[model samples]
Target chain A: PSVFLFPPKPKDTLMISRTPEVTCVVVDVSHEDPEVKFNWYVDGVEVHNAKTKPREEQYNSTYRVVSVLTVLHQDWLNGKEYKCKVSNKALPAPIEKTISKAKGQPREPQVYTLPPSWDERTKEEVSLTCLVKGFYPSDIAVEWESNGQPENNYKTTPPVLDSDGSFFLYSKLTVEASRWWQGNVFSCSVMHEALHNHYTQKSLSR
Target chain B: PSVFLFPPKPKDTLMISRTPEVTCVVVDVSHEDPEVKFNWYVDGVEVHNAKTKPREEQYNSTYRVVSVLTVLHQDWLNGKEYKCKVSNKALPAPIEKTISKAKGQPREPQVYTLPPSWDERTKEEVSLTCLVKGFYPSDIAVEWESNGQPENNYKTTPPVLDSDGSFFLYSKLTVEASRWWQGNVFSCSVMHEALHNHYTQKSLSR
Candidate 1:
């Protein structure tokens, strides 16, 4: 009978300050050899002897062993690599698995609009605010369109970063009150790296 | 001077159970008129007098009023509809916005595979298990493929529902040990409505 070793579960990219702690666990291995051993590495340097612990269990006459390594919050922020290496006399070579940082994509944006109040409506001008929130990656673009043509009478605030590494922003557009009262649709378009050529939009009408 | 009323902020859909409780608040309105009023309805039936309260406040010389309605958990499960209607002398007709039931799409599935242990690695047969979790909308399909050809020697469990309305599932595939030892690539493909023709896959090799 031949022994088989399972691959380790992959870890997600971690945000530096937000996620200050992490643990890497090598999956349980099944083998008949009683002389099996495990080793841990950080950026290619062996650390199992100093900071890791291996737990073994016997169930139904089968041997199962799991190795775990904990990386400090500061050490993770300083950019250190982690790996688990398992070796046994029943195997030809050691099986190595490396832990890497996570790089996650942003979530879809939630787009909304705040129309001008009647008190602020004038024959000459009116302003509407468009807000987009719950997105990651600070880079985002907002554009205003009036009657299907790009309109430049608008201003966008700097992206506000949230505690969870998400971002939000607001854009305000001022247009002629007559145009707004004429039932023309005003659309606010948002573009972000997470989206392909596809963008999200919110529209307001009188 | 003419008074203007802003539309109420729309609320997201909610899942209802035997004891489903819900509340909807009309956004604060701005105007100089002291006679501003609010009305609540359920499927076109008046509910303001029986189960709602309207709170008015004066801020910065402007009148702001918000209406809130609380429905019994049982009322929602009875297929009753809810809406908030705003009325004031400044507007021609009352503005209405309805409460809706949530129809949420599933999140991306986290796919993983568990290979056979030494006990199952004999020359006869071996099995692999694929698992997907943390997704919504119980409807999902999983398929097994070997070397680009559809493999049917597998069994899939029914979707297991979670407390938060999400779902998880597992599929197991069995093939001859000779085939697995030959270094053939086995892939698990998952299909969900939330995903386009785009599917998620996890592959394992000897």
Candidate 2:
């Protein structure tokens, strides 16, 4: 009779702030053999700096092992994909687990027009702001578009960590008042892991 | 200006077996105020034996605290509801987080008919079995019904935990062969927190 061994399976990965200036991502895997090997990948490229530790335990007559990997969280915020691959002679090919982007937070974007003051109303610029609150993992992309063309004259603030462990972000776009008056479509678009589609909105009527 | 303090929010709860004979459930809550208080509940009743530990830290002058709760897993498997409540003086209402049953595992029911042996075929008896596999938390109810009438002449085995941290259960119902021949519409119904509706199926033909 052949004794079958189970290959390693990765646990859910977590991203957290290790310190005020440092963020980290942690990955874990478990299997029945301590000799199982793990390989880490970020955005399809092999990552070498990942620190790994393996722990072994005995249950009855069987042995169980768990491995952990830690990497810088900045790479994740930069939209890098992470995957953990486990390989052993257990039975078949290596098993790989990809980090799901939606595991971290829930975010929704609300766009509004920041109307100009009475004196500045006559100026050529109108301001549009996109406010996103109650999010986690602090990796969001906010952009502005004018008549379907991407506009880069926008400023996005760094995510502000809320006391609740969620995050708040504000992105402002300043465009020509004539664009607003002429009904030239101005939209604020936001991208986050928690959103199904790019969360977008047109300027509300003044 | 009023500074609002957000109450702690519970993270996802976990159910695990620490040993072959011991099972446990763990819940964690995090907030920015060290003064926040936590209370645990099982089936809407306050639990005093729950072990809670609060850890305090400072991030850029903002105080952060996390509390963890541990309880016996048997209580969860017995269909007891678990909730974590956090209270602080900053807001209008206490923050409450309910444990989600789907966080642990996913399962579905498979039903089949067990025909009697050649010698016993002449006997007026028929057997049906409902098999449910790959589920977690182990709080599943299996029942039998005939033409909308409740059935009690059935046996359901205790949940058997698999090596992969899931559970499997089998339920068998035996009835008169006349009822099967008359097409009395025998159905097996299974209820679990992971299912949206009661998972049910009619007996399979021989």
Candidate 3:
């Protein structure tokens, strides 16, 4: 019922020479009918080196399989696409999942600092959010600055893909309520490949 | 583990005027620890009449929940956005899936007609492919014509969304090998809002 290539991500494994690989995991629909076939493709060509692992059965009577395809690091860095195709007789058609580095031009993110809500000016720890949105490629680094000091305690959520293929994510930084009360300048520094300066910061006070 | 808005699609149900609805289904991870919360939002405001069905358990010990959001047909026509947000204690963050009318500028399809192979010119039925690519919004009508006559039997696959947010799909038109070998013209007409003429035709002959 489900087929995916998570992380769907390929790695830049700095090997003897630039050898990188991407793996595809297929959620096999076993005995539940016609046996399935899996293949890896790139540039519309079947990858000969694809090694599909045997299905590992699960307690639920179903199983999963994995396929790995190795390619030149240049291919990955160049944003080439890789696809995993799953076909079976249980029903009519086949399904495919594809992954590739960002293909579109870089689009800068619009950063916003959502200062945690003041709980009746309570003394509990406050959570500040750095909302970075409308960025392409989803490759970004976010950091917090409290009065020129780097704040390390924060949680950055995964990127949320937009219908238009842009991405947005948020990092929540927890700060001491007493520290927030002090005349402090809290800033969120967002560095992205899209910006000319490659950095954008939004700050809040009070 | 799965959250999606199928079709995520809203339709125009003509009535005293126009009424429409969209549905979102969430695959509740039973045991799943931490209860789950489902919400519908439009314009960043929580939709009031959202009716979330109770979790229906499956044979696998897991369960699922469904939610519906009804809106003015005008909003659907205007391409307003709708979102389904799933959150629970088990999750470090809330998950959201959004649906909206296509936002990018319309892009026309690049059509290619792949004629059935000669196959030793055997008298078997042949399946010709009408491959269409790079269209936006995934709204299009495809037709097959054999020698000025409409071919009734064919299969049109679902649009495959591309990384750039464009779409592609194929229609397989099966014709008697004799019909294709006898110098008959088979044509595929694709009509999409993206085209200036709103139509594209690719044809082939034996």
Candidate 4:
């Protein structure tokens, strides 16, 4: 009889942040067979009743075998670890990787102040602004719509660098700042490579 | 004696999806306040480690609310019964909303088999057919692509309604069935309004 042994795979890595309760986890299952099955675990316990599948038709040769695990909130203590294991019946053993929360630093978002209400009598203009903070590889953009039509009366500037060593950014939209804009909501959004989706603002009145 | 209600505001609503593992919670705060705080919980357990400020500034208005929690995942059971609570010193009561998961129906994507591959020489001419199973709103379109481009060389008859309450559709692409089509792959795709975001394809290899 011949014995075969499979080497351990690199562990999945998770990065955390303050805004949006965003929990990001990345795992490498590249070394396994093309038909290998993937299983995910958080804090050493398998997610209960979780069904996961890979995106189809993606080029396997060029990109890392990647899976993103998102959670609203996560606990770093209590030995919180995320793992992705790949296995094939023909292989001697399953390959797995584990990543700890301590690997990446999570930063809190910045608090923003809403500009004063516009006074129509004074001919003063009013604008709404959105603030985002502490993101890596910042690729953030803001879209503003008044009533229904697209408006460019707004302004967007680069993220502000904070003293806490994290990034800070703000977006503003200038308007007549009247009672109509009073109930009108302003939204700020952020996007990045680690996250598969974007985050936007919620209507205040809603 | 005058009675003052602490935190004179209503709690925001929290939403969660069962299959997608997406959760969002919101809370209202005072517009005049310079600072506000958000706290999150999962199944009554605290998940305060992931908190951040808004990415940008908020416009002045009667509503000054924020998303206490937002996340995405394929697993919903992991964070069942999530909640977002907001507070400020000026308020007497903290507003809170519990997150509940909503189930989603999963349907197998409709798959369609494409027409046969085209070739030249001994296989002077070849014709391919298309078929689809398990789809709603039978109104669909069949399109053919040859060599990475749409083929206009062929003609397709309108889909023939089937007696079995399913779709039986066929389209033909003609070419000399020769060595060139020997290893070539012909693809057929299905498009419908009901499945606008979803599509199915089949390839015929000769």
- DockQ of all models, two decimals each: 0.01, 0.01, 0.01, 0.01
Q: Write the per-residue lDDT of candidate 2 for residues B31-83, one digit (tens) a residue.
A: 44446665666577886456354455555344444444554544544444566
> Which residues of candidate 1, in runs, are more than 4 Å off?
A1-206, B1-102
As a TM-score, model 2 comes out at 0.28
Encode model 3's per-residue lDDT on A96-121: one tens digit a residue: 99888778887888775655442324
Tens-digit lDDT string for candidate 4 (B3-118): 11121110111111111222332334344664556666666677766544452344543344344343343123223565656666555555545554333332232545554443
Question: What is the number of backbone collisions in each predicted candidate, taken in the order shown?
Answer: 2, 0, 0, 28
List, residue by residue over A1-206, the lDDT tens digit for candidate 4.
11121111101112122212112222333443345455767667776344345453335442233344443332432235666665655457766666543334444343243554444335567556666666543334444553323467767677666676666676766666464345664433333323221222222211
Which of candidates 1 and 3 is the stronger one according to DockQ?
Answer: 3
Q: What residue runs in model 2 are displaced by over 4 Å at the alpha carbon?
A: A1-105, B1-206
- TM-score (0 to 1) of chain B for each candidate: 0.48, 0.47, 0.62, 0.38
What are the per-residue Cα lDDT tens digits for candidate 1 across B165-187?
Answer: 78889999989889999898787
lDDT of 3 by residue, B77-156 (tens): 45788887777545655566787776777788867665554332464666666656678767667878866778876666
Off by over 4 Å in 3: A1-206, B9-22, B31-37, B50-55, B70-79, B87-94, B112-114, B138-168, B179-191, B196-206
lDDT of 2 by residue, A97-200 (tens): 66534344455533333333333347666555454555775556667777667887666656665445666555555567876677676676666545554344
User: For candidate 2, what is the recovered fraction of reference interface contacts?
Assistant: 0.00
Q: Which tens-of-lDDT digit does each residue in A54-167 have in candidate 1?
A: 556666565665555555433543346676666766668877766544346656567778998879875479889998887775546677875435798999988798876787
Give TM-score values for chain A, per-prediction.
Answer: 0.48, 0.47, 0.57, 0.40
